[PDB]
Amino acid sequence: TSSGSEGNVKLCSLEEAQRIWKQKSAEIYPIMDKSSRTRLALIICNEEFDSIPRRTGAEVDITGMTMLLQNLGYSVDVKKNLTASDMTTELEAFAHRPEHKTSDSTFLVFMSHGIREGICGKKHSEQVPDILQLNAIFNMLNTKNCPSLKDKPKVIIIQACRGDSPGVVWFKD
Amino acid sequence: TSSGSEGNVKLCSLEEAQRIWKQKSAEIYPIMDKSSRTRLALIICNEEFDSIPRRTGAEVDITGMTMLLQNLGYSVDVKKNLTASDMTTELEAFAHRPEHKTSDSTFLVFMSHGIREGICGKKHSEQVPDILQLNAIFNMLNTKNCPSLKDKPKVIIIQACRGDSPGVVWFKD
Amino acid sequence: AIKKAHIEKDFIAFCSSTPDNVSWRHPTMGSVFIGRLIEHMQEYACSCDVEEIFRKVRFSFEQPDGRAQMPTTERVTLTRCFYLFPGH
Amino acid sequence: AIKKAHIEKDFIAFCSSTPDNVSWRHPTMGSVFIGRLIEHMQEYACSCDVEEIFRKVRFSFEQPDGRAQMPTTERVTLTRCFYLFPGH
Ligand SMILES: *C(=O)[C@H](CC(=O)O)NC(=O)[C@H](CC)CCCCNC(=O)c1ccc(Nc2cnc3ccccc3n2)cc1
Numbered sequence: 001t002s003s004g005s006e007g008n009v010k011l012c013s014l015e016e017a018q019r020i021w022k023q024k025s026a027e028i029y030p031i032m033d034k035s036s037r038t039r040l041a042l043i044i045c046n047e048e049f050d051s052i053p054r055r056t057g058a059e060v061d062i063t064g065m066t067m068l069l070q071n072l073g074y075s076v077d078v079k080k081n082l083t084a085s086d087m088t089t090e091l092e093a094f095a096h097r098p099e100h101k102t103s104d105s106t107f108l109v110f111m112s113h114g115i116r117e118g119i120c121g122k123k124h125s126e127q128v129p130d131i132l133q134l135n136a137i138f139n140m141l142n143t144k145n146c147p148s149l150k151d152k153p154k155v156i157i158i159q160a161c162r163g164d165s166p167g168v169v170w171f172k173d
Numbered sequence: 174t175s176s177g178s179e180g181n182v183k184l185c186s187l188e189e190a191q192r193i194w195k196q197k198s199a200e201i202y203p204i205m206d207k208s209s210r211t212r213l214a215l216i217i218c219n220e221e222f223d224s225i226p227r228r229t230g231a232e233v234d235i236t237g238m239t240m241l242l243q244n245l246g247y248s249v250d251v252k253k254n255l256t257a258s259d260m261t262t263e264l265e266a267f268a269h270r271p272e273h274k275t276s277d278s279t280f281l282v283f284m285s286h287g288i289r290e291g292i293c294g295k296k297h298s299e300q301v302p303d304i305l306q307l308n309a310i311f312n313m314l315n316t317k318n319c320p321s322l323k324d325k326p327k328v329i330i331i332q333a334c335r336g337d338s339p340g341v342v343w344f345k346d
Numbered sequence: 347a348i349k350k351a352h353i354e355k356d357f358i359a360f361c362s363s364t365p366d367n368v369s370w371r372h373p374t375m376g377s378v379f380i381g382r383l384i385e386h387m388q389e390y391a392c393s394c395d396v397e398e399i400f401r402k403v404r405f406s407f408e409q410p411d412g413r414a415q416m417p418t419t420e421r422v423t424l425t426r427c428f429y430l431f432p433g434h
Numbered sequence: 435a436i437k438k439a440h441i442e443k444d445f446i447a448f449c450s451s452t453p454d455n456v457s458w459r460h461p462t463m464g465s466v467f468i469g470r471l472i473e474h475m476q477e478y479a480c481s482c483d484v485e486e487i488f489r490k491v492r493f494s495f496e497q498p499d500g501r502a503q504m505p506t507t508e509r510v511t512l513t514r515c516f517y518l519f520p521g522h
């Protein structure tokens with residue numbers, strides 16, 4: 001039933017959980033006890049922009065990702081329509097959250113327009129770029145800047161264009 | 174015995190090969206018949222440079238990688254001490270090899286000094302950079318520039334520094 | 347006592363397309379990569395690690411249509427398999 | 435008849451360290467990443483796919499010594515598991 005906390009996410013049974021833990025030795029990331037852990041996730045989504053087309057349908061993505069991460073046991077913070085500077089400030093704040101200490105992992109979700117160089121902030125234009133680089137995201141969440149997430153999986157998901165090309169070539173059979 | 178073509182590489186038995194092919198459905202890359210396939214690999218290694226320190230020990234890496242790739246069924250081309258332009262010319266030539274048509278995969282190995290931006294050519298200095306970017310390697314081997322390797326695994330291995338930092342942070346237990 | 351730790355470890359990035367290329371989005375149905383990722387996570391989180399799941403997402407894009415894209419996994423320093431163990 | 439194909443697919447890159455960071459090399463023993471990779475390929479090519487093997491290589495670097503480095507897998511568009519099937 002999808003009426004439970006995990007919603008539409010298929011459950012891992014106790015037998016399946018024991019089998020995975022037995023098949024592989026010490027090659028799995030440790031999971032903290034459900035009763036005590038404080039898992040955190042962050043979604044940054046830009047839909048409305050100053051100078052580039054509106055990202056119609058973004059709300060569907062926000063809903064889906066928020067519910068999915070909650071299903072997986074994460075407390076989700078949702079921030080909308082930020083400049084690259086605002087994204088940096090939000091990421092730095094996320095890295096400083098005390099909950100990461102009592103967490104085993106984190107998810108970061110970015111959804112915006114994008115170019116080859118990175119992710120577009122709300123104020124982005126060709127004349128005055130407003131870009132957050134993927135490199136900056138990694139740096140802000142690494143062991144130096146986020147010691148609380150040492151040894152813990154940090155999953156970054158990015159929905160964005162990475163250029164203008166269609167991504168295809170022709171071939172004949 | 175390591176006297177066979179596969180040397181020190183542990184053999185996959187017929188039972189193990191059948192088990193892997195049975196455990197996973199259509200989620201494995203197809204392998205071409207051993208009798209007809211023409212697998213190609215390329216190693217580019219820079220040891221002696223005009224303006225940066227000598228890469229002593231590189232010969233050990235060349236020997237090991239050449240023998241390993243041969244063990245795995247690849248015909249290995251070894252090129253030494255090239256500029257970034259020469260590496261590009263070699264890569265373009267590799268992408269044009271007719272053998273890829275009758276191959277199922279390829280390995281590319283780069284071994285040199287490196288900086289944040291990419292891999293150092295033999296003529297590299299701080300004043301006049303001689304750098305091959307990883308982006309260029311991918312472009313030269315993609316479906317547009319290398320149609321013969323469409324749908325086929327292209328494994329790129331790079332031994333190089335990516336900057337000057339030690340890659341470590343301190344923490345107390 | 348102080349000890350050394352890798353500055354960058356246990357990361358995985360998953361992008362909606364390859365470099366230079368567009369990612370697609372429907373005005374009422376949302377982004378295809380996001381929708382596909384949710385579906386695959388819902389289905390496979392119980393039995394597959396996250397890296398395995400991301401590969402399956404990629405595979406679902408294998409056959410190109412009129413709006414082709416190829417999700418890319420980037421800068422991976424996961425030293426272990428990350429299983430979500432949903433329900434636990 | 436012409437058909438569309440993804441411009442970039444079925445790639446895996448494996449680097450000796452993380453961005454910004456050094457990779458180590460011994461004057462007589464060679465590069466540690468290269469030596470480690472050969473060993474793991476010799477051992478695991480029979481039973482593991484290349485992505486699995488690369489993760490194992492990473493894991494072997496997990497505990498930092500005086501010369502720490504963390505090999506990174508990059509720009510992965512493998513849609514399937516690449517098994518080498520050594521001997522076949
Ligand atoms: C680039 O910066 C952005 C990235 C973003 O997430 O916003 N992408 C775009 O701006 C692209 C242009 C390259 C999208 C523009 C919107 C136009 N949309 C379409 O043309 C279109 C048409 C049909 C569909 N169909 C479809 C079918 N099935 C599904 C299933 C699930 C989800 C969506 C979906 N869509 C989509 C889009």
Ligand SMILES: *C(=O)[C@H](CC(=O)O)NC(=O)[C@H](CC)CCCCNC(=O)c1ccc(Nc2cnc3ccccc3n2)cc1
Pocket residue numbers: 228285286287332333334335456457458459460461463464465466469470501
């Ligand atoms: C950066 O551009 C280059 C990358 C390259 O491949 O050349 N790297 C360097 O120039 C680094 C400096 C950051 C290497 C300089 C050479 C100095 N070497 C050492 O200090 C050193 C000391 C001890 C060891 N030990 C050791 C132990 N076990 C093994 C096992 C297998 C292989 C090597 C090995 N080495 C190594 C290096």
